[PDB]
Design a protein around this ligand. Structure first.
Ligand SMILES: *[C@@H]1O[C@H](CO)[C@@H](O[C@@H]2O[C@H](CO)[C@@H](O[C@@H]3O[C@H](CO[C@H]4O[C@H](CO)[C@@H](O)[C@H](O[C@H]5O[C@H](CO)[C@@H](O)[C@H](O)[C@@H]5O[C@H]5O[C@H](CO)[C@@H](O)[C@H](O)[C@@H]5O)[C@@H]4O)[C@@H](O)[C@H](O[C@H]4O[C@H](CO)[C@@H](O)[C@H](O)[C@@H]4O)[C@@H]3O)[C@H](O)[C@H]2NC(C)=O)[C@H](O)[C@H]1NC(C)=O
Ligand SMILES: *[C@@H]1O[C@H](CO)[C@@H](O[C@@H]2O[C@H](CO)[C@@H](O[C@@H]3O[C@H](CO[C@H]4O[C@H](CO)[C@@H](O)[C@H](O)[C@@H]4O)[C@@H](O)[C@H](O[C@H]4O[C@H](CO)[C@@H](O)[C@H](O)[C@@H]4O[C@H]4O[C@H](CO)[C@@H](O)[C@H](O)[C@@H]4O)[C@@H]3O)[C@H](O)[C@H]2NC(C)=O)[C@H](O)[C@H]1NC(C)=O
Ligand SMILES: *[C@@H]1O[C@H](CO)[C@@H](O[C@@H]2O[C@H](CO)[C@@H](O[C@@H]3O[C@H](CO[C@H]4O[C@H](CO)[C@@H](O)[C@H](O)[C@@H]4O)[C@@H](O)[C@H](O)[C@@H]3O)[C@H](O)[C@H]2NC(C)=O)[C@H](O)[C@H]1NC(C)=O
Ligand SMILES: CC(C)[C@@H](C)/C=C/[C@@H](C)[C@H]1CC[C@H]2C3=CC=C4C[C@@H](O)CC[C@]4(C)[C@H]3CC[C@]12C
Ligand SMILES: [Zn+2]
Ligand SMILES: [Zn+2]
Ligand SMILES: [Zn+2]
Ligand SMILES: [Zn+2]
Ligand SMILES: [Zn+2]
Length: 222
């Protein structure tokens, strides 16, 4: 029930670097998740991945996803709505069974193992989801001092497109993306073989994942 843009890794771009994913054709179907990879996926991405058997990610990909999400978690953990939206984006990007329909590989290069690895890709993104995602993180204050968390996870982004641009720009060694990820908002409606990323999104004043008024303006008494 899966279609992927990439699956597993095909070597390093340079020494001291990390593994980079292998592009796969659209007709590729991944195997069933191992017991170990499934339990790890539930710990990293939440209980919504329990009954998932086919995923577009291997165990090494889930581990790399875990190590990077844990570095960014303390910056936004005070606001559950932002943390939920933040984790949900990169979890679907890495492992969703429909990853091949909203992620488009645009550039590759050869690794040290002499195999094709991802150099640049596009993520077709629903504007409304990205806008609400930015709205749930923009007002988070970092408990140390009184600066905005958006200065670190978003580089001081003022709108959602600059936010996603900061997340997707290739920033290896700086805990960022190992390759260039471009978020596209102009996917034509005539394209039926592609779709935009879209999911449940949680506002910072949502009842289930409410954030403090110091981190959310709509959570303050009006
Ligand atoms: C998902 O991701 C994939 C992969 O990234 C995307 O696939 C690409 O889609 C585009 C269209 O959306 C395709 O462009 C069309 O390509 C054909 C074939 O192009 C070759 O031959 C023509 C001659 O027939 C050459 O002119 C081309 O060289 C350059 O053309 C233009 C002119 O400047 C330039 O912008 C291109 O970047 C291209 O540069 C490439 O040339 C070298 C030399 O070979 C190449 O090695 C290198 O890759 C350079 O990037 C090219 O050699 C072409 O005929 C079409 O031309 C007509 O279309 C446009 C409108 O679309 C008109 O403006 C134009 O005047 C022509 O009338 C297109 O250029 C592209 O090939 C394709 N990539 C593939 C198949 O690998 C998907 O689009 C993505 N899906 C999304 C976003 O939904
Ligand atoms: C979130 O906030 C960001 C930051 O403000 C914002 O990004 C900016 O968006 C605007 C609008 O899309 C961009 O403005 C365009 O800029 C290009 C060139 O930009 C370069 O140079 C600046 C210099 O500071 C750099 O910062 C930037 O990164 C780029 O390197 C211009 O060419 C554009 O002018 C055309 O605009 C229209 C589109 O074509 C035309 O109608 C218009 O007539 C202009 O045409 C001219 O250019 C054509 C192309 O060459 C040419 O054919 C024509 O003859 C004519 O000369 C436009 O001004 C701006 O660059 C973005 N900046 C950054 C840093 O991203 C986001 O839009 C915002 N997002 C949301 C959702 O709110
Ligand atoms: C990007 O994300 C957006 C937010 O999730 C997406 O917007 C959603 O788009 C769908 C499809 O266009 C809408 O569903 C339609 O809603 C209308 C209106 O429904 C209301 O009115 C009718 C009576 O007129 C009533 O019967 C309903 O119960 C509602 O009260 C319906 O008429 C349609 O049949 C269809 O259900 C969503 O409502 C809309 N949601 C939001 C929050 O805007 C957008 O589609 C996404 N774009 C892409 C390209 O993925
Ligand atoms: C807080 C700052 C540093 C911003 C940029 C956050 C970055 C993290 C959370 C995000 C940005 C891009 C994401 C990312 C890019 C691409 C891949 C390759 C894939 O095969 C495994 C997931 C992985 C490795 C993920 C992990 C999480 C990353 C690295
Ligand atoms: Zn590996
Ligand atoms: Zn989800
Ligand atoms: Zn859109
Ligand atoms: Zn580019
Ligand atoms: Zn098409």
């Amino acid at each position: 029930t899966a279609t992927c843009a990439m699956y597993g890794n095909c070597g390093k771009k340079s020494v001291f670097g990390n593994e980079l994913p292998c592009p796969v054709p659209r007709s590729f179907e991944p195997p069933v998740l191992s017991d170990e990879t499934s339990k790890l996926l539930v710990e990293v991405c939440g209980e919504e991945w329990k009954e998932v058997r086919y995923a577009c990610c291997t165990k090494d990909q889930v581990v790399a996803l875990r190590d990077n999400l844990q570095k960014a978690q303390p910056l936004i953990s005070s606001c559950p709505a932002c943390l939920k939206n933040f984790n949900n984006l990169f979890c679907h990007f890495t492992c969703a069974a429909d990853q091949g329909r909203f992620v488009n590989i645009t550039k590759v290069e050869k690794s040290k193992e002499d195999k094709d690895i991802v150099a640049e890709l596009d993520v077709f993104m629903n504007s409304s989801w990205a806008s609400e995602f930015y709205d749930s993180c923009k007002n988070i204050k970092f408990s140390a001092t009184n600066g905005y968390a958006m200065d670190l996870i978003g580089g001081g982004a003022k709108n959602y497109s600059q936010f996603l641009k900061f997340l997707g720009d290739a920033k290896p060694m700086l805990g960022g993306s190992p390759f260039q990820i471009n978020y596209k908002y102009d996917l034509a409606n005539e394209e039926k073989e592609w779709q935009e990323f879209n999911d449940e999104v949680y506002a910072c004043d949502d009842a289930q994942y409410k954030c403090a008024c110091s981190d959310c303006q709509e959570s303050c008494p009006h």
